[PDB]
Structure formats: structure tokens, C-alpha cells
């Protein structure tokens, strides 16, 4: 029989929830933790509906139109960095902010315009509701909206399509970066953990495990486990995230940075 819970939403946060869930269940007999993707928007909508136990989100609940943040309870567990990624043959490893904006708005349409190969650019976006996309537009693109593009439903699908598609650019959480794609530096600042801690790399968000009301039972126990120093000092960092105590800045709802 045992005790089961389900967490759904953010694909950026999914790898940490899956890893922590399997670790928790192997350490606590008779427990089951089911994890799905769907994106931040689905996480927030499903937790508001009370259709799941945990909504996994890269955003504060109030950032999403139609979500009543006051019936949800926030639990922050990590910071995740987001990086542009390109197909390995585009011929560049860095863009300025202005170049990045011009690419995503469609003003620049060939990589040669930014010192790369003579190759048409193929924008790959996530769907609206993606917390990666929201964070990338706000802190990467200075609130510019992307040109209409091919869309993919998850972090993993964005990575695979970028890998195999000549000319492709997209964005993905730091953990998803691997040898099949190339992360870009921006303004010659690299997408590293240290640079997120200082906000020298600005494209990052807090990772949230939302509940409907204050949680009980296995939901409560698992969240406590994910936030515990033992797990923060190990698994969180291994999978590419930052424990919040590593941050040397804090960021508020107006985007204001305080240095701490």
C-alpha cells in the first residue's frame, strides 16, 4: 500500500525533484514519489486546482495570470541558472546582450552577422507558461518578446532539437547543458555557478515547491528533506543548481537586487 504523492511542473526543476524523490524513497520504506514535467505554468495551475500535492515552479505564483498566490504556500529549494544554447556548428561562443535581443526579435537572421558561419538562424522557443522562457525574456532579453518560432514542450526537447538542427538557438536550465550543445557566454560573462551567485550572470531564478495550504504527511516530509542541509550540501549542487545559501545577492519582485 504505502504513502504516495505527486509533484508536477517545471522541467528545469524536474531533475532535482526526480533525484531527491528516488533518494528519499530508497531511504524511507513504503513511500512513493511520482514526478512529472509539463512546465511551470502547468505546475502552478495543477497545484491551484488541488490536482497534485506539489507544483514545481521556476516562478513566484503571483507571476502567472489567474493564479491566486494567497491559497498556495511557497517553499524555495534552489536557484537555477538559465543559459542560451546553440547548435555546435553556428561558429560563435559569445553574444552581447544587444546581439542576443536582435537575434530573438528577428532583426539579425544569419550567424555571420555576429561573427559566426554563413548560416540562417533558427529560433527555438519554449511554449508560453514555461518558467525558463519567462526568466530568459525578463533577464536575458530586457523584456523583449521573441519572434514567432518553432516551439518545444520541455527543456529536454529544446536541447535535442538544438543539437540536431543547423543554425539553432534556444535557452535551457544549466543542468541540461551537455556535449551535444554549446552554451553561450553573454557579454563575455560565462554561465557558471559563481557568476550566478554574484548576479554577474543575471539569467537565473528561484526554484519553488508549492503546496495548496500548509502541507502534511509525505508532502511535508519530502519538502523538509529537499530543504535539509544534508541534501542542500550534496545533491542540489551535484545536479547543477545552487543552494540558496550560496547566493551573494537576493532578488525581489520588482527585480531589484540587494547585495548580501
Q: Residue 59 sits in a domain of what CATH number?
A: 3.40.190.10
**Is the CB of residue 126 less than 8 Å from the CB of residue 158?**
yes
Domain match, 10 and 112 both: no
Domain match, 130 and 161 both: yes
Domain match, 85 and 152 both: yes
Q: Packing angle between helix 217-227 and helix 14-27, nearest 10 degrees?
A: 110
Domain match, 122 and 69 both: no
Cell digits of residue 214: 500548509
Domain match, 139 and 218 both: no
Domain match, 127 and 196 both: yes
Domain residues for 12? 1-78+201-260
By DSSP bridging, strand 54-57 and strand 204-212 are: antiparallel
Q: Of 200, 233, 252, which residue sits at a domain end?
A: 200
Resolution of this model in Å is: 1.5
Domain match, 63 and 89 both: no
Q: Of 183, 200, 217, which residue sits at a domain end?
A: 200
Q: Packing angle between helix 131-139 and helix 40-49, nearest 10 degrees?
A: 130
Domain match, 140 and 67 both: no
Domain count, the chain: 2
Whole-angstrom Cα distance, residue 37 to residue 41?
A: 10
Whole-angstrom Cα distance, residue 6 to residue 218?
A: 10
Domain match, 110 and 37 both: no
Q: Of 200, 227, 252, which residue sits at a domain end?
A: 200
Q: Which residue's entry shows cell 534556444?
A: 170
Domain match, 248 and 167 both: no
Amino acid at each position: 500500500a504505502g504513502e504516495s504523492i505527486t509533484a508536477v511542473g517545471s522541467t528545469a526543476l524536474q531533475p532535482l525533484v526526480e533525484a531527491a524523490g528516488e533518494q528519499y524513497t530508497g531511504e524511507h520504506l513504503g513511500t512513493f514519489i511520482n514526478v512529472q514535467g509539463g512546465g511551470t505554468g502547468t505546475g502552478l495551475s495543477q497545484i491551484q486546482e488541488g490536482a497534485v500535492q506539489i507544483g514545481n515552479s521556476d516562478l513566484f505564483a503571483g507571476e502567472q495570470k489567474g493564479i491566486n498566490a494567497r491559497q498556495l504556500v511557497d517553499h524555495r529549494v534552489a536557484v537555477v541558472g538559465i543559459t542560451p544554447i546553440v547548435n555546435k556548428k553556428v561558429g560563435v561562443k559569445n553574444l552581447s546582450t544587444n546581439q542576443l535581443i536582435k537575434i530573438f526579435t528577428g532583426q539579425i537572421t544569419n550567424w555571420k552577422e555576429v561573427g559566426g558561419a554563413d548560416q540562417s538562424i533558427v529560433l527555438i522557443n519554449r511554449a508560453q507558461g514555461s518558467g525558463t522562457r519567462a526568466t530568459f525574456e525578463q533577464f536575458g532579453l530586457a523584456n523583449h518578446r521573441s519572434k514567432t518560432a518553432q516551439e518545444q514542450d520541455s527543456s529536454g526537447m529544446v536541447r535535442s532539437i538544438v543539437a540536431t538542427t543547423p543554425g539553432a538557438i534556444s535557452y535551457v536550465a544549466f543542468s541540461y547543458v551537455n556535449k551535444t550543445v554549446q552554451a553561450l557566454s553573454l557579454n563575455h560573462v560565462a554561465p557558471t555557478e559563481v557568476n550566478v551567485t554574484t548576479n554577474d550572470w543575471r539569467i537565473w531564478s528561484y526554484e519553488h515547491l508549492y503546496t495548496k495550504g500548509h502541507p502534511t504527511g509525505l508532502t511535508k516530509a519530502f519538502i523538509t528533506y529537499v530543504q535539509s542541509p544534508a541534501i542542500q550540501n550534496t545533491l542540489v549542487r551535484q545536479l547543477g543548481y545552487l543552494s540558496p545559501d550560496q547566493m551573494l545577492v537576493e532578488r525581489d519582485a520588482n527585480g531589484h537586487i540587494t547585495k548580501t
